[PDB]
Write a protein that binds this ligand. Structure first.
Ligand SMILES: [Zn+2]
Lengths: 148, 146, 148, 148, 50, 50, 66, 348, 49, 107
RNA sequence: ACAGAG
């Protein structure tokens, strides 16, 4: 049984692959007004030079589909539109673009910009660091060339 | 916990101990504990008639009421606590200049949802005795050095 | 009025369309001209009050007028991560034969809450693998599955 | 005294190139007594300035009116009578660039002085007999109160 | 031709697609090859330009 | 994989390590965080003197 | 494989709501009504029941039995 | 006798990434043992190795002789290889979230009170700077409130105490410099550092980042030694996440949505370009086309269509940037040059 | 092709050289029709974060 | 076993000192910074965690005149303990008041 | 001999 740690590669189902860098407690997370503090904080610098808007719509569609028990389709060349998931968030009291008012968790004072909450389907990849760490001081050598 | 088929058996022996929540998250006494500030929606200009109907749908369903004084609907704030701040008054172009959405800084609304270990009146009473018990620990490390 | 803007700067957290302004906490001595923001115990003990607005089993909602963010956040963090409870840390397995693994069964039994009051017990010392009357409990799960 | 410059100024513009920011405007003013134009960045959140206002701008080398140059660290807390008790807006920066005027090929007297209030700028451009005492790397208080 | 409750007596998934062999214990797949069409006049250039 | 490219000009060395990397800005720009499992293996001959 | 005991984001006990969730889908509810009748307010608790696959009911069919 | 001790804090160890293009693909660092299972280094060194932290592996080589230690520490040090040997441009410099965070710190809108200024400045007091007196600078605004503009808080990085002999001087253009201001520009984009106090202008990539010269760390490297340019990068990598993770900086689908000012210009520009391309198609197929010199009749048409279809992209992308508000996230990340460009905003 | 998940319904009676499983898999929240056509959401690979 | 360690500045006699509070986090550090900054004899006060593996905070205090920086630290601890005492008393009074006023309804 | 990873 392996538990995730610093060095385990996660994915994003859009090509925004990434290793873990830091594991913070629940108390040091930012949090909403409802008490939801996120699992996986993601850097917003991946998006301009890679132009994944599909993650920005998967997040919003999943958020508008968990509040009323649907599975919004993300079918290629079609699917659930943006104008139909913006109206399911306002009906349940959230913002129409996902951006939420966030009180921070270290200082206790609210953040200036709004932060963009929603569920994204992250998958765990097989490249773990416990099967890639490796260190040789001196050991067995080859027979023909006396080198490791 | 598990789910069995005939011929399969589970026998074990658990050992509960005492631990803080910083160690592992199975010691956290609350489901989630959080807070928010208290809103004070204020009306800078009077919103009367049919514009008070497109104001009381740009908020939570119990905060803005519409009442009549002369057979004409005028809107006032009624209970600004219940708002969740979806900020739908900024999609409405005519009504951005008649509100000032804000938060009162020195007024917090806590929410403590216990998991069933002990009721949440004692949880907050225990949480203050720990912050009282952190300031007592370093007062006895100034008196021991000096 | 400029004094109206100074008063709104230190008493309200406004929410604009694009960002939340006046996020920080400013009432410290020296930050304002005519005001006195040094520590005064009588003014804090006069302005503070607690209003309990909802309570039943396993829920509580109340107010704290007068405290600042750096103490309400401290209370939230002590509730999340520094109030102790009772939970399973050892599982001693005799004949697990099911399809649920042993580590997953130990994990699922780790998360079940226990009704024991944690003010009566004490911490188990470093080591001390047996456990005594003072600092542990002991449950026993035994389920055998047959036919009807 | 310690006054370097003192004149009454009338505002003639607020934002020539649009409102680039939220808290800072760009006052383009012009004197009555002498012939001085004046670029000035103020903080319009704490101190709002309209389009037809008329203020009295004093630039001083020190804030204590006897002429005492004792300034190694400014204490914000102490209440001792200074020059600032007659004004409404005080800044503190450093003169960093004295510049000749390239709008005349010969026989000119216009000298520009640049003061930077830690990112808030001020060009004070006029005749070279009025700007006496502005040296490079000197630190000056701006002082400013509106009139009727 | 089997029902999903009869894959249980063979220890096999209803969703395992198939198309693969079993040789000495391992699962081996003959992959799809991609070849040019035979009996067709290819009119092409030489290295020297002809 | 001959002698002159495989065993003479570049050859397999010891006292080495290879692990996945991860960011940390709390170190200086001339530091590197070696794990404990690699630091227990990679040793250095420290000659004894006064 | 089986329903997890706690929600991952906040920590509400979810893993006893599953047999009630399927029982309220036996009585012809929509899922948005069953998740409100179980008391799940926040959406992180709602995705624990809304997105869960029950693999143990179909892994136990291949398990050895007398 | 020879004791073969474990690797401990302060040893010189080499550090390698496997495709080794130039000589800064292998440098020597000072190891410091930490319990988790990765190699870890400051993100200012992601530019020489070209690593990206996405399942990326790197090699390690511990020297075994004292002479191999001294040839690795003096020749192959990170503080002695801050510039590339190619043209002399700095490579170890700021990267993303240290350019965006320092850009938003040095804008003119940010005004800190005494508590948050002390809190942001107090983050750098770890390392070899735990012993210094912090030298909080005097406040800008005094009478109505007491405020610190963020350029002072950034200038703490260049001179964090009264005994540091650093005097940095820099005077260059920004990125969004309008061409006619020279320290009075409307964009506030003309950098002036005088005696290590930031006097005017925000901090772009071309002042803190790994691009080219007029870098303030390159100014410290050429004027005040190697160590003073390497202490300031640690202060920046320490200070900018503390401000950025407590300001808040997010992106969203409302940061790339087109408003009403674009969905009317796009339609007219597409119609104009499509009608001119249809006219050139009709003028090629059924008669006279005024042939460009040096090409055939069809290669002339290609130049006119690639002219007209590049008018639609440029006049449609200069119509989205006029309706984006400030504090847009890709617009901020394109003005400071950290990640992205204007073509990416105008393309998505 | 490398995400951890579940192989099939016989993933426990199976002895392979190497097999990676996930503890609590969840089916996706935003899904293509191809997912319904190849029955991916009967045995998924990933968790909603 | 020692949870407090005073590291003074190299050039100043006891009015610039970096308190190292072992086995703590942002919790005590933020509240103690808030109660030290309400003292008008303190010019600078702010904490930083050293490294997230290590549970420490470097609380730096610099006073204005000649007083040592042990006195605002101790006054911050005492005033924070008094604030928590009064909060506990008011909260217990309000819990007993709600439990008493609901016990007189529906009876 | 093949598949991966950067
Ligand atoms: Zn939850």
């Amino acid at each position: 049984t392996r538990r995730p740690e610093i060095g385990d590669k996660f994915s994003s189902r859009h090509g925004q692959k990434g290793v873990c860098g830091l594991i913070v407690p629940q108390e040091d997370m930012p949090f909403c007004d409802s008490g939801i503090c996120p699992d996986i904080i993601m850097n917003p610098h991946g998006f301009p030079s890679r132009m994944t808007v599909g993650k920005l719509i998967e997040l919003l569609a999943g958020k508008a589909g968990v509040l009323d028990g649907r599975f919004h389709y993300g079918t290629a060349f079609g699917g659930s539109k943006v104008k139909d998931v913006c109206e399911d968030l306002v009906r349940h009291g959230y913002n129409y673009l996902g951006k939420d008012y966030v009180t921070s968790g270290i200082t206790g004072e609210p953040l200036e910009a709004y932060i963009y909450f929603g569920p994204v389907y992250y998958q765990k990849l097989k490249h773990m660091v416990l099967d890639k760490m490796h260190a040789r001081a001196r050991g067995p050598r080859a027979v023909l060339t006396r080198q490791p | 916990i598990a789910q069995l088929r005939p011929g399969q058996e589970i026998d074990l022996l658990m050992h509960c101990v005492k631990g803080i929540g910083k160690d592992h998250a199975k010691f956290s006494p609350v489901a989630t504990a959080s807070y928010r500030l208290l809103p004070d929606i204020t009306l800078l200009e009077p919103v009367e008639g049919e514009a008070a109907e497109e104001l009381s749908r740009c908020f939570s369903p119990g905060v803005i009421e519409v009442q009549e004084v002369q057979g004409k609907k005028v809107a006032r704030v009624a209970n600004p606590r219940l708002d969740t701040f979806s900020r739908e008054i900024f999609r409405n172009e005519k009504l951005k200049k008649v509100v000032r959405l804000a938060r009162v800084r020195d007024h917090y609304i806590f929410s403590v949802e216990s998991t069933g270990v002990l009721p949440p009146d004692v949880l907050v009473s225990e949480a203050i005795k720990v912050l009282m018990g952190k300031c007592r620990r370093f007062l006895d490390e100034l008196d021991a050095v000096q | 009025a400029a004094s109206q803007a100074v008063e709104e700067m230190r008493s309200r957290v406004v929410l604009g369309e694009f960002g939340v302004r006046n996020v920080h906490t400013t009432d410290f001595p020296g930050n304002y001209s005519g005001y006195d923001d040094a520590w005064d115990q009588d003014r804090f003990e006069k302005n503070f009050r607690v209003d309990v607005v909802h309570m039943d089993e396993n829920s509580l909602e109340f107010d704290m007028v007068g405290i600042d963010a750096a103490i309400a956040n401290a209370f939230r963090r002590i509730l999340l991560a520094e109030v102790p409870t009772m939970a399973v840390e050892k599982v001693l397995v005799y004949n697990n034969t099911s399809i649920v693994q042993d580590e997953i069964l130990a994990h699922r039994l780790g998360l079940i809450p226990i009704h024991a009051d944690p003010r009566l017990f004490e911490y188990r010392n470093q080591g001390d693998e047996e456990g005594t009357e003072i600092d542990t409990l002991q449950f026993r799960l035994q389920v055998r599955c047959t036919r009807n | 005294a310690g006054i370097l410059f003192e004149d009454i100024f009338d505002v003639k513009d607020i934002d020539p190139e649009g409102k680039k920011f939220d808290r800072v405007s760009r006052l383009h003013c012009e004197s009555e007594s002498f012939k001085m134009d004046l670029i000035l960045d103020v903080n319009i959140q704490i101190y709002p300035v309209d389009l037809g206002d008329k203020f009295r701008l004093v630039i001083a080398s020190t804030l204590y009116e006897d002429g005492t140059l004792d300034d190694g660290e400014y204490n914000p807390t102490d209440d001792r009578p200074s020059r600032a008790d007659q004004f409404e807006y005080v800044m503190y920066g450093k003169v960093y660039r004295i510049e000749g005027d390239e709008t005349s090929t010969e026989a000119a007297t216009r000298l520009s002085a640049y003061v930077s209030y830690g990112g808030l700028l001020m060009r004070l451009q006029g005749d070279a007999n009025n700007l006496h005492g502005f040296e490079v790397d000197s630190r000056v208080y701006l002082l400013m109160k509106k009139l009727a | 031709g089997k029902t999903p409750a009869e894959f249980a007596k063979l220890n096999e998934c209803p969703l395992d697609p198939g198309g693969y062999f079993i040789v000495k214990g391992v699962e081996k797949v003959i992959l799809i090859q991609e070849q040019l069409s035979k009996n067709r006049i290819i009119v092409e250039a030489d290295r020297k330009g002809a | 994989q001959g002698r002159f490219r495989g065993n003479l000009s570049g050859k397999r060395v010891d006292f080495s390590g290879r692990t996945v990397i991860s960011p940390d800005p709390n170190l200086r720009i001339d530091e590197v965080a070696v794990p404990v499992h690699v630091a227990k293996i990679l040793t250095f001959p420290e000659k004894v003197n006064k | 494989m089986i329903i997890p005991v706690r929600c991952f984001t906040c920590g509400k006990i979810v893993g006893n709501k599953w047999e009630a969730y399927l029982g309220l889908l036996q009585a012809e509810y929509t899922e948005g009504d069953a998740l409100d009748a179980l008391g799940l307010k926040r959406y992180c608790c709602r995705r624990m029941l809304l997105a869960h696959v029950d693999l143990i009911e179909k892994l136990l069919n291949y398990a050895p039995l007398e | 006798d020879i004791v073969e001790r474990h690797l401990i804090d302060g040893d010189v160890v080499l550090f390698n990434r496997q495709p080794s293009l130039h000589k800064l693909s292998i440098m020597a660092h000072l190891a410091r043992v930490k319990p988790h299972r990765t190699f870890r280094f400051n993100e200012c060194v992601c530019t020489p190795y070209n690593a990206d932290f996405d399942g990326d592996e790197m090699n390690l080589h511990l020297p075994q002789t004292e002479e191999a230690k001294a040839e690795a520490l003096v020749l192959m040090g990170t503080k002695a290889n801050l510039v590339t040997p190619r043209n002399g441009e700095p490579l170890i410099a700021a990267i993303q979230d240290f350019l965006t965070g320092a850009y938003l710190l040095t804008l003119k809108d940010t005004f800190f009170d005494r508590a948050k200024a002390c809190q942001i400045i107090a983050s750098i007091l770890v390392g070899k700077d735990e012993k210094i007196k912090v030298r909080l600078p005097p406040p800008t605004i005094l009478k109505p409130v007491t405020l610190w503009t963020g350029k002072q808080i950034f200038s703490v990085i260049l001179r964090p105490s009264d005994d540091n002999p650093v005097r940095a001087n820099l005077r260059t253009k920004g990125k969004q410099y309008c061409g006619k201001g020279e320290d009075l520009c409307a964009n506030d984009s003309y950098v002036t550092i005088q005696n290590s106090e930031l006097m005017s202008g925000s901090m772009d990539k071309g002042t803190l980042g790994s691009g080219s010269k007029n870098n303030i760390f390159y100014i410290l490297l050429r004027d005040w030694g190697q160590n003073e340019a390497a202490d300031a990068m640690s202060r920046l990598a320490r200070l900018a996440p503390v401000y950025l993770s407590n300001r808040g900086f997010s992106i969203g689908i409302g940061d790339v949505t087109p408003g009403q000012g674009l969905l009317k210009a796009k339609y007219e520009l597409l119609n104009a370009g499509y009608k001119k391309c249809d006219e050139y198609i009709e003028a090629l197929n059924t008669g006279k086309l005024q042939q460009q010199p040096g090409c055939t009749a069809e290669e002339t048409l290609e130049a006119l269509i690639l002219k007209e279809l590049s008018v639609i992209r440029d006049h449609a992308g200069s119509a989205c940037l006029r309706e984006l508000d400030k504090s847009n996230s890709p617009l901020t990340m394109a003005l400071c040059g950290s990640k992205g460009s204007f073509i990416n905003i105008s393309q998505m | 092709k490398q995400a951890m998940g579940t192989i099939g319904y016989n993933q426990r009676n199976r002895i392979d050289t190497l097999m990676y499983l996930l503890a609590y898999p969840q089916k996706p929240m935003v899904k293509t029709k191809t997912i319904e056509l190849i029955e991916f959401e009967k045995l998924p690979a990933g968790q909603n974060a | 076993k020692t949870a407090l360690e005073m590291v003074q500045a190299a050039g100043t006699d006891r009015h610039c000192v970096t308190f190292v509070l072992h086995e703590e986090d942002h919790t005590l550090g933020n509240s103690l910074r808030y109660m030290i900054m309400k003292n008008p004899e303190v010019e600078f006060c702010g904490y930083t965690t050293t490294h997230p593996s290590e549970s420490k905070i470097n609380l730096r205090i610099q006073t204005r005149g000649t007083l040592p920086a042990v006195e605002p630290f101790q006054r911050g601890l005492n005033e924070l303990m008094n604030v928590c005492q009064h909060v506990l008393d008011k909260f217990e009074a309000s819990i007993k008041d709600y439990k008493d006023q609901k016990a007189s309804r529906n009876e």
